[PDB]
Design a protein around this ligand. Sequence first.
Ligand SMILES: CO[C@@H]1O[C@H](CO)[C@H](O)[C@H](OC(=O)c2ccc(C)cc2)[C@@H]1OC(C)=O
Ligand SMILES: [Cl-]
Length: 138
Amino acid sequence: PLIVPYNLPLPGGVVPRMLITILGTVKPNANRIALDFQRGNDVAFHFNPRFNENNRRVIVCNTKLDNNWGREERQSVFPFESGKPFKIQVLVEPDHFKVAVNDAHLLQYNHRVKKLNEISKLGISGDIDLTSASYTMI
Ligand SMILES: CO[C@@H]1O[C@H](CO)[C@H](O)[C@H](OC(=O)c2ccc(C)cc2)[C@@H]1OC(C)=O
Ligand SMILES: [Cl-]
């Protein structure tokens, strides 16, 4: 039982082979989830499941630099369901973040922010009960 929004420090930034695991349950009638990998005020990787965008479910991925959002990448495969427990795993690879949900590959996001050692915080927010947030090296 962790408080949301939750800030997970990533000491010395991210590195390839770092695996971040988030466990939680989506609230009933959820609207959004967001994981935000931050480099200071910039958001290196915004992973944003939206439960009702024009009556569609979509995952939006983006980067925020100097307070400006970039070109969105959208994924229509949507493994989350209101009321149900999930596992999100984010594996940092040399050229992209790799995301799996409930042990199935979901998407990859090419690194736009290239100073990986400066991506030193993960913010977790949205309509979830958060059970665990941790990292390890594989
Ligand atoms: C072009 O709309 C924007 O798209 C962006 C991705 O391209 C972000 O998702 C952004 O949302 C936010 O920054 C945000 C942060 C905190 C909270 C509580 C709500 C939204 C916003 O989306 C929406 C949905 O406004
Ligand atoms: Cl950079």
